[PDB]
């Protein structure tokens, strides 16, 4: 037995070294340029590594794991008795490839056009528009073409996609696609946690919801802005109004209080090559790993310009041979994008911390984790003085120091309840509550309830607004980035004591701390061998997810909002929760 368990995980682990690096492969190819033959080689592959999947998989099942005495291989075993969409019969699994490759390419190669005029792309045209335009109707001429054109036609495809997910989830002895997903985490208590870290963040955000509504009403007006009611969506600076820092011209608290950093970027010669490589250098500054030489040479930092179609949405890859790694990302030079350059470089970070494991443990304490490590980085990158330090700016005062907040927050706290949504509602449809014919009413009840969000237009039959989310048709799970922004903050707080910060931990800037690297280098390394607490107690201390971490790093800006809104009478939350625009 022992013996047995023993030799199948090193078989198991050297083919599928050699399996995994050939489909990432075609992956790659298909994603950094989207055509038919690409397209077609990447659904053989999927049958390749199906087979695989299905060979090794059947042989795990024999074997009794919880009678058996090696806690690795045990884990190992356990994880290779999924076979996730392998358990599929060759006809639902071939059917579902290609529903998942249709729903991908839909996405990435939708335009939304003016009448016999130009078609924008969602990047960087629709996102520009969104994040610049000051004009309700031009954003809702985005906003709502995006929908018209990507989401409505992502619906013909997902009732399939959600039945033959289930299936597969089902044959793995889960109960739905939802449940499936939810297990990465290892928390029964998963649910009720979240739930309690999201209603902790409930006051900030009904604070900052309030103020940046308030200062809409301004700017827009008050026949199109409802101080008691839900903002209308296609306001906040982002196609999703999931991250708000693009309207802070609109909210500054102190307008007398700093410059243009993409105008700085923009003529001191920032290109994105150079945004990569000062996330590179931030991470070597803290101990961490450099990128090798490869990286610089096959990775895809911005949107090509030979014609080629391709997936523009950021992604880390693993091809699975600790040598290469690569990021594919339509780069545009602005603060912004950097951040999401962080994020990524955080994720190739963790492939090479782990990079010694076998491949079925090569993953991060949990997603959320995999997430978050980018993020710590570039709070730190995001301090007023870091960016002076990068010659981005040319502050120091309170009132500096409550726009800093400001800015942050809009990205940060308003995020909370936009990522906490996403699978609110995919675990529901999962799970058979939302029918088909519901999909996108459900959404925007879930869209009002957490995040106080209308549509600006309404909604008609033939409308799934979630099909316009990159993630929905991707298949990509999303409870991992509010996992993320919670404990990321919980990584700061500990990596800035482990630096010796003191002081209010949003002036903390780790950059070049040997300490806070190790913190996270010894965590990294043990990819996803050990249950998440244990990372989670290495990196600060405790076990346990907390939002005290984002409470204490917002803290000032709480208090100057309860005192500004209070001020100016404000009435928190959406009362008139049925209030729709003109
Ligand atoms: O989706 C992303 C970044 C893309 C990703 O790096 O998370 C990427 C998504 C993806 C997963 C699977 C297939 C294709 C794309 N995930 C990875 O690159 C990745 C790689 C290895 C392990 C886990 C994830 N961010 C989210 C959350 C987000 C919004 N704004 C942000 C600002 C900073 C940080 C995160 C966000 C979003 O844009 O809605
Ligand atoms: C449980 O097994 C792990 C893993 O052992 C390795 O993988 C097996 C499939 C087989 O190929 C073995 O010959 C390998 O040694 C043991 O952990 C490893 O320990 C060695 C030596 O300390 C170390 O180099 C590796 O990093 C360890 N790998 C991991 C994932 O921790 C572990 O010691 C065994 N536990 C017990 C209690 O015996
Ligand atoms: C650089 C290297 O050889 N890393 C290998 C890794 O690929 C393999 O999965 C592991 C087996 O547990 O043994 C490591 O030494
Ligand atoms: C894109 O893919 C097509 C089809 O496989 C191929 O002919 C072409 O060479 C590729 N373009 C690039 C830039 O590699
Ligand atoms: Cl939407
Ligand atoms: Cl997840
Ligand atoms: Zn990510």
Redesign the pocket.
């Known amino acids: 037995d022992e013996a047995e368990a023993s030799k199948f995980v090193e078989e198991y682990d050297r083919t599928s070294q050699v399996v995994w690096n050939e489909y990432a492969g075609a992956n790659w190819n298909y994603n950094t340029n989207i055509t038919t033959e690409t397209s077609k080689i990447l659904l053989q592959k999927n049958m390749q590594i199906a087979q695989h999947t299905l060979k090794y998989g059947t042989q795990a099942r024999k074997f009794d794991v919880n009678q058996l005495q090696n806690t690795t291989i045990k884990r190992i075993i356990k994880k290779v008795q999924d076979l996730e969409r392998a358990a599929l019969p060759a006809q639902e699994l071939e059917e579902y490839n290609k529903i998942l490759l249709d729903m991908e390419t839909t996405y990435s190669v939708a335009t939304v056009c003016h009448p016999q005029g130009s078609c924008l792309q969602l990047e960087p045209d629709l996102t520009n528009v969104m994040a610049t335009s000051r004009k309700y109707e031009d954003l809702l001429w985005a906003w709502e073409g995006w929908r018209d054109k990507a989401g409505r036609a992502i619906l013909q495809f997902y009732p399939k996609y959600v039945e033959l997910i289930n299936q597969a989830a089902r044959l793995n002895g889960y109960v739905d696609a939802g449940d499936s997903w939810r297990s990465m985490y290892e928390t029964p208590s998963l649910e009720q946690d979240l739930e309690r870290l999201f209603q902790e963040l409930q006051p900030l955000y009904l604070n900052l919801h309030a103020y940046v509504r308030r200062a809409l009403h301004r700017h827009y007006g008050a026949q199109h802005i409802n101080l008691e009611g839900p903002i209308p969506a296609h306001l906040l600076g982002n196609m999703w109004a999931?991250?708000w820092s693009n309207i802070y011209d609109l909210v500054v608290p102190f307008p007398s209080a700093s410059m243009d950093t993409t105008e700085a970027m923009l003529k001191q010669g920032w290109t994105p090559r150079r945004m990569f490589k000062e996330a590179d250098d931030f991470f070597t500054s803290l101990g961490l790993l450099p990128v090798p030489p490869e990286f610089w040479q096959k990775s895809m930092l911005e949107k090509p310009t030979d014609g080629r179609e391709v997936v523009c949405?950021?992604?880390?890859?693993?091809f699975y041979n600790g040598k290469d790694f690569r990021i594919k990302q339509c780069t545009t030079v602005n603060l912004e994008d950097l951040?999401?350059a962080h994020?990524?470089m955080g994720?190739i970070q963790?492939?090479m911390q782990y990079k010694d494991l076998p491949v079925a443990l090569r993953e991060?304490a949990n997603?959320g984790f995999?997430?978050a490590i980018?993020?710590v980085l570039?709070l730190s990158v995001s301090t007023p003085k870091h960016l002076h330090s990068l010659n981005l700016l040319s502050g120091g005062s309170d009132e500096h120091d409550i726009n800093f907040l400001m800015k942050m927050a809009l990205?940060k706290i308003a995020?909370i309840p936009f990522?906490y949504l996403v699978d609110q509602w995919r675990w529901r449809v999962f799970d058979g509550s939302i029918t088909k014919e519901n999909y996108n009413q459900e959404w925007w009840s879930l869209r009002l309830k957490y995040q106080g969000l209308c549509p600006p237009v309404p909604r008609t039959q033939g409308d799934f607004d979630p099909g316009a989310?990159?993630?929905i048709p991707?298949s990509?799970p999303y409870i991992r980035?509010f996992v993320?922004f919670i404990i990321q903050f919980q990584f700061h707080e500990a990596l800035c004591q482990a630096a010796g910060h003191t002081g209010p931990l949003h002036k903390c800037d780790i950059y070049q701390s040997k300490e806070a690297g190790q913190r996270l280098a010894t965590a990294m390394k043990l990819g996803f061998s050990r249950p998440w607490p244990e990372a989670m107690q290495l990196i600060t201390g405790q076990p346990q997810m907390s939002a005290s971490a984002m409470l204490s790093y917002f803290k000032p800006l709480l208090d100057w909002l309860r005192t500004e809104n209070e001020l100016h009478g404000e009435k928190l939350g959406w009362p008139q929760y049925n209030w729709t625009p003109n």
């Open positions: 999931q991250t949405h950021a992604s880390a890859w693993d951040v999401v994020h990524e994720h963790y492939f991060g997603p995999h997430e980018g993020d570039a990205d995020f990522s989310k990159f993630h991707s990509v980035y993320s």
